């Protein structure tokens, strides 16, 4: 993947600079709210022992990456669907008029959708969208895996999201802008240019999660 390779180089450059080992760290100087992501994962359900992984994006669309490596996405209009086959082939349909062959996957998606709306909190609900973000192409979940410390989510647009279990912190890595959004334990949403974190430094909490992120991107490339 070209985007994962860029992300790795971006992360190696910042991590090699040891951004928390500075006389004076000025993390705030790296903030660039112009790099706010349009899409991130706001909810997820790991039923991979039977069906797969369901999730919600911040625009309230939902998706499922099924165990057979196909994906079904329901847009936020509640009726439009996109089906992505194992090999990435994309097709479009609706809940109202769909191939009979997708009826079971549609039903499973609705179970996931409903489980998430009834039971799960929406992450990033405090970030308000901008005009022109509604035209953005919806990404789908390309792959994911879980570690002792986090769940790693790789979206088809190139972005990598890492959700840390213990403290509910999250990283959203955008290789297209060489930027990262950090959601801290207080749910504050800050977006940084990696180049500026290298120059101006960053605190130890973010520095360590960026080392973790590099380990996870190496793993994604190994697979």
């Amino acid at each position: 993947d070209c985007h994962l390779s860029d992300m790795l180089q971006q992360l190696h450059s910042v991590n090699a600079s040891k951004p928390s080992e500075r006389g004076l760290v000025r993390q705030e100087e790296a903030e660039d709210p112009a790099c706010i992501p349009i899409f991130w994962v706001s909810k997820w359900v790991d039923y991979s022992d039977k069906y797969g992984l369901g999730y919600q994006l911040c625009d309230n669309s939902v998706g499922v990456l099924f165990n057979d490596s196909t994906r079904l996405i329901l847009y936020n209009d509640g009726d439009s669907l996109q089906y992505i086959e194992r090999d990435g082939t994309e097709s479009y349909l609706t809940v109202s008029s769909h191939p009979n062959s997708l009826m079971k996957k549609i039903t499973l998606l609705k179970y996931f959708r409903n489980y998430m709306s009834e039971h799960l909190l929406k992450a990033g609900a405090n970030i308000t969208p901008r005009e022109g973000d509604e035209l953005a192409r919806l990404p789908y979940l390309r792959t994911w895996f879980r570690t002792r410390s986090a769940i790693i989510l790789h979206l088809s647009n190139g972005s990598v999201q890492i959700n840390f279990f213990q403290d509910h912190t999250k990283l959203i890595l955008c290789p297209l802008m060489a930027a990262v959004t950090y959601i801290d334990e207080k749910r504050d949403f800050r977006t940084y240019r990696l180049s500026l974190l290298e120059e101006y430094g960053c605190c130890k909490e973010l520095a360590s999660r960026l080392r973790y992120a590099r380990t996870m991107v190496d793993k994604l490339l190994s697979s």
Binding site: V45, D46, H119, H168
Partner: protein
């Protein structure tokens, strides 16, 4: 979602929102706070 639909792992549940919990506690009746 179906009656048999019991995901073993998932993101944080609504009840596990401690910021809303602590919030409501501040709006509800409670014992005496420090003055």
């Amino acid at each position: 979602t179906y009656e048999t639909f019991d995901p073993p792992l998932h993101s944080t549940a609504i009840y596990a929102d401690e910021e809303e919990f602590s919030k409501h506690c501040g709006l509800s009746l409670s014992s005496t706070p420090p003055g």
